[PDB]
Amino acid sequence: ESTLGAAAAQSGRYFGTAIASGRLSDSTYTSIAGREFNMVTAENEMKIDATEPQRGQFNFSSADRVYNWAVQNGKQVRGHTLAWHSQQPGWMQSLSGSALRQAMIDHINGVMAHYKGKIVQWDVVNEAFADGSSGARRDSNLQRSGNDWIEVAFRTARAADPSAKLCYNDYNVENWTWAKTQAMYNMVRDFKQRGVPIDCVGFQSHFNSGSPYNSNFRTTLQNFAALGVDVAITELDIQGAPASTYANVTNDCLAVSRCLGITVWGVRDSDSWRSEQTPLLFNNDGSKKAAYTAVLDALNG
Numbered sequence: 001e002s003t004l005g006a007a008a009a010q011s012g013r014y015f016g017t018a019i020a021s022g023r024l025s026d027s028t029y030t031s032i033a034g035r036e037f038n039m040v041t042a043e044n045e046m047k048i049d050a051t052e053p054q055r056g057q058f059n060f061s062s063a064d065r066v067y068n069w070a071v072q073n074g075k076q077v078r079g080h081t082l083a084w085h086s087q088q089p090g091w092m093q094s095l096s097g098s099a100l101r102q103a104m105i106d107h108i109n110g111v112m113a114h115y116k117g118k119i120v121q122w123d124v125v126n127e128a129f130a131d132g133s134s135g136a137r138r139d140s141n142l143q144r145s146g147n148d149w150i151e152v153a154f155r156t157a158r159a160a161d162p163s164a165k166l167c168y169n170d171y172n173v174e175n176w177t178w179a180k181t182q183a184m185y186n187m188v189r190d191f192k193q194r195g196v197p198i199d200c201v202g203f204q205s206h207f208n209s210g211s212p213y214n215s216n217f218r219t220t221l222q223n224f225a226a227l228g229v230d231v232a233i234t235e236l237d238i239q240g241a242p243a244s245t246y247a248n249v250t251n252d253c254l255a256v257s258r259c260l261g262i263t264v265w266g267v268r269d270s271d272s273w274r275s276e277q278t279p280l281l282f283n284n285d286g287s288k289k290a291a292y293t294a295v296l297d298a299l300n301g
Ligand SMILES: O[C@@H]1[C@@H](O)[C@H](O[C@@H]2CNC[C@H](O)[C@H]2O)OC[C@H]1O
Pocket: 043, 044, 126, 204, 235, 273
C-alpha cells in the first residue's frame, strides 16, 4: 500500500498521528495528515485543562474540532487523557484527598459521556510512575490521594463507556530492563489479579539518547500482551529520525499480535513538540524523510 495507514490496515493495525487544532488551517498539514493516517490523537484538546477549564463546566469546542476532523477524514480517535498530574487546570491543582477524588471521577464521567461509543481507546491514566531506579509512583495530588487513584480511574471509565478500550500510558517504559518498566508491569499484573478493568498499555515511545530504543522493546511488548492486555505505541518520535530505528520499532509492533498500531507524535518535524530534534517522518516542507520510507516498507513487509 502507498500510505502508512493503509499499509498498517493490511494487518488489521492502524498508523496514527497527533493532531493540533491550531494547525487545521494549514493545507499542507491537513492534506498530508488526511492522506497518511487512519488514527488521530488530539495533541492537547482532550486534556483536563482544555475540556474542564472550571469545575463542572466543560468546553469541548477544540476537542470536537479535532474529533470531527478525524471522523470527516476517515480516522478513528484515541482519547488523551483523563487523569494526569500535568496540564491540570488550576481549580483541580487546588484539590486534594477526597475532594480531588470526586473531581477526578466527575471529570472522567463528563468527558467520556460526551464521547460515549465514539472513542476506540482512552488513555485513562497517564504518567503515574517516577523516572529512575525506584519504580515509585510519581508525586502528585492524585497520587497523594491514595495508591488506588489509578484503579478508581479505570473502574470509573469502564462504567462510563463499556465500549472503549481503557489504556494506561507512560514513557520510559519501553526497555524491559528498566525499573520504571517493571513498575508498570507489576501494576498491570496486580490490576489483572484484582479485576481492575485495564485493556491496553500505551508505550509513548519518545526515544532519544538518554532513553534509547533497545531491541528488547519487542520483549516488553510481548510480556505485557501476555498479561492479557493490548499494547499500543502511542507517541512515537525518535531523535534524528534514523530510518533504522523507525524500521525496528515498526517491526516490533508487527511481531506482536496484540500490538494495535503506532501513532507518531506529529506530522512534520516543524509540528513536533521536540522539533529541534527533527524526530518525525515528514520534513518541514511536507516531503517524506528516509524514515517515512523505512516505516512504509516495514508495514508492507
Ligand atoms: O504540545 C505539547 C504536547 O505535544 C505534549 O504532549 C505530551 C508529550 N509528553 C507525553 C504526554 O502524554 C503528551 O500529552 O504536551 C505538552 C504540550 O505543550
